[PDB]
């Protein structure tokens, strides 16, 4: 009924202070992707709106850059960035697909 699947760039461990690329990809469906969100359980980081492009949430402006593609680049990692990240695809007519990335910002 809902055939598509999400690949991700995989679960991440990274040193404090670097920048890193998170990305998902929807495959094996032809639904139109109307909106992609990046979230953190309680927090919205960015919206790529179908025909309008990317908006970064004002509470993440200088921490997150849009791209590449439908992905994000987190900019100067802090231990607080550790957590689960979600790419959420709003599609017609399949619906909502979600993929999950866990990020662990270490202090080696």
């Amino acid at each position, epitope marked *: 009924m809902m055939t598509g699947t999400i690949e991700t760039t995989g679960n991440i461990s990274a040193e404090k202070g670097g920048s890193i690329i998170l990305q998902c990809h929807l495959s094996s469906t032809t639904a139109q992707v109307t*909106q992609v969100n990046w979230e953190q*359980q*309680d*927090q*919205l980081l960015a*919206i790529c*709106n179908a025909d*309008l*492009g990317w*908006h970064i*949430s*004002p*509470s993440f*402006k200088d921490r997150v850059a849009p791209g590449p593609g439908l992905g994000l680049t987190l900019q100067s990692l802090t231990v607080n960035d550790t957590g689960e990240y979600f790419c959420i695809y709003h599609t017609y007519p399949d619906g909502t697909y979600t993929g999950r990335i866990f990020l662990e910002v270490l202090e080696l």
Partner: antibody
Framework: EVQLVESGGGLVQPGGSLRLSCAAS????????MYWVRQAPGKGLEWVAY????????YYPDSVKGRFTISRDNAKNTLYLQMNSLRAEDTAVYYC????????????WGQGTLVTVSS | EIVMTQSPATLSVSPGERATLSCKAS??????VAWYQQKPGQAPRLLIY???ARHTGIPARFSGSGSGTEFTLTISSLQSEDFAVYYC?????????FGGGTKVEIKR
């Protein structure tokens, strides 16, 4: 149909405290980020507070930080604004507003409560 | 804080004509600008988001444009009901800031 009904405004004295409420109906309140916005008599619009879906993060401008506290009860579908140390320049119609789920701005507003601070 | 300047604060336009409201930004706000219409005794309603996108239920004679620091709202085929104060707002960064407002008086 989406509705934001506000209550709790009134007259309260300098230094006093008041709690405004905003009852949401017609959408999944727990899905939505919320704000409060105020407007002094004959003046423009002033952002006042912001709360996340859950309640774990809040933001305020300096003008009000420390004295106002935004909170929410997703069980009751109700948003609250807790006001302390009310000064004169806090007289205003206070609006609640839900954030667009397609962008980061203010989709729909309540009718507002008047809050008069005076001796 | 990013200061949103709406000038003129007042415009007098004849019915059927085209009003052009201006909104400048003290710094680049990208396209994270919205436009609200506030009629007397009424809550603001959202007209434009994302600098140029029209909220649903909003007549097509309302149109927004601009990026960076200079933004514009245009009310075509102006009519009596359009009498209101119009505010621009930036949501690029905190604290969120509204413009001063431009009252559109209909010059009958």
């Amino acid at each position: 149909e989406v509705q934001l009904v506000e209550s709790g405004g009134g007259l309260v004295q300098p230094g006093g405290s008041l709690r405004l409420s905003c009852a949401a109906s017609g959408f999944t309140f727990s899905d939505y980020y919320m704000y409060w916005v105020r407007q002094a008599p004959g003046k423009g619009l002033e952002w006042v507070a912001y709360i996340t879906k859950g309640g774990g993060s809040t933001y305020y401008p300096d003008s009000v930080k420390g004295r106002f506290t935004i909170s929410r009860d997703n069980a009751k579908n109700t948003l609250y604004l807790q006001m302390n140390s009310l000064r004169a320049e806090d007289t205003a119609v206070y609006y609640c507003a839900r954030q667009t789920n397609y962008d980061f701005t203010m989709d729909y507003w309540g009718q507002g409560t008047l809050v008069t601070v005076s001796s | 804080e990013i200061v949103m300047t709406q000038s003129p604060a007042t415009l007098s336009v004849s019915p059927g004509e085209r009003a052009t409201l201006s909104c400048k930004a003290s710094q680049d706000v990208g396209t994270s600008v919205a436009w609200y219409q506030q009629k007397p005794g009424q809550a603001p309603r959202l007209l434009i988001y994302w600098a140029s996108a029209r909220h649903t239920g909003i007549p097509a004679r309302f149109s927004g444009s601009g990026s960076g620091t200079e933004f514009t709202l245009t009310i075509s085929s102006l009519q009596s009901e359009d009498f209101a104060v119009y505010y621009c707002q930036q949501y690029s960064s905190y604290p969120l800031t509204f413009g001063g407002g431009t009252k559109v008086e209909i010059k009958r």
